[PDB]
Design a protein around this ligand. Structure first.
Ligand code: NA
Ligand code: NA
Ligand code: NA
Ligand code: NA
Ligand code: NA
Ligand code: NA
Length: 207
């Protein structure tokens, strides 16, 4: 499957793509404002994620640091990124269909649209100014808006027992972005697409 990743932000981002225990395609790349990077994701990929990283520095070996979404200091991510990270999430070719969503469960750093480029389903978007409106206690000094699990490490925010409810913090994310997951047991906003669809992830879609 192809994913075109497009940076419409006025600032550089470092795109990242991983399924948690491996890179997808090259795993990461710099995208200056306006640049597009197309990756190939193997059919059947389960639990894939794409995200933006901000304020990165990398040496020639591709080692360094980002202020949001850092994946163990690598340009080319093999693992998931450090919150806060707006997440494009997908599982492909799962009994004949693809499943996509956007999640704020690991916080928010960059606004995002995640849409099919082929027929048969709609896209999802979280493009509100969540960083600007972020509750004081969730603001990440390094940048972005943390989720409450990251900040407070409670069973209720992290849904550790599989029994949690919405919270004042999850409701903030849900108010600003109704079409993204705001906590683990949120009413799902997953979209079913035809199996083997192709996609576009756009950072700052309303820029
Ligand atoms: Na992101
Ligand atoms: Na990184
Ligand atoms: Na998530
Ligand atoms: Na506030
Ligand atoms: Na939260
Ligand atoms: Na936007």
């Amino acid at each position: 499957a192809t994913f075109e990743i497009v940076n419409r932000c006025s600032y550089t981002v470092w795109a990242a793509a991983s399924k948690g225990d491996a890179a997808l395609d090259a795993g990461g790349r710099q995208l200056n404002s306006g640049e597009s990077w197309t990756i190939n994701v193997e059919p059947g990929t389960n639990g894939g994620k794409i995200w933006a990283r901000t304020d990165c520095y990398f040496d020639d070996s591709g080692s360094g640091i980002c202020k949001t979404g850092d994946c163990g200091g690598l340009l080319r991510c093999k693992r998931f990124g450090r919150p806060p990270t707006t997440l494009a999430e997908f599982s492909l070719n799962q009994y004949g269909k693809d499943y996509i969503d956007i999640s704020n469960i690991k916080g928010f750093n960059v606004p995002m649209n995640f849409s099919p480029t082929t027929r048969g389903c709609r896209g999802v978007r979280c493009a509100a100014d969540i960083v600007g409106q972020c509750p004081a206690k969730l603001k990440a000094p390094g940048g972005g808006c943390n989720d409450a699990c990251t900040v407070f490490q409670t069973s209720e925010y992290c849904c550790t027992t599989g029994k949690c409810g919405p919270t004042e913090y999850s409701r903030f994310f849900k108010r600003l972005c109704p079409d993204a997951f705001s906590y683990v047991l949120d009413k799902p906003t997953t979209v079913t697409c035809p199996g083997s669809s192709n996609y576009r992830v756009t950072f700052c879609p309303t820029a």
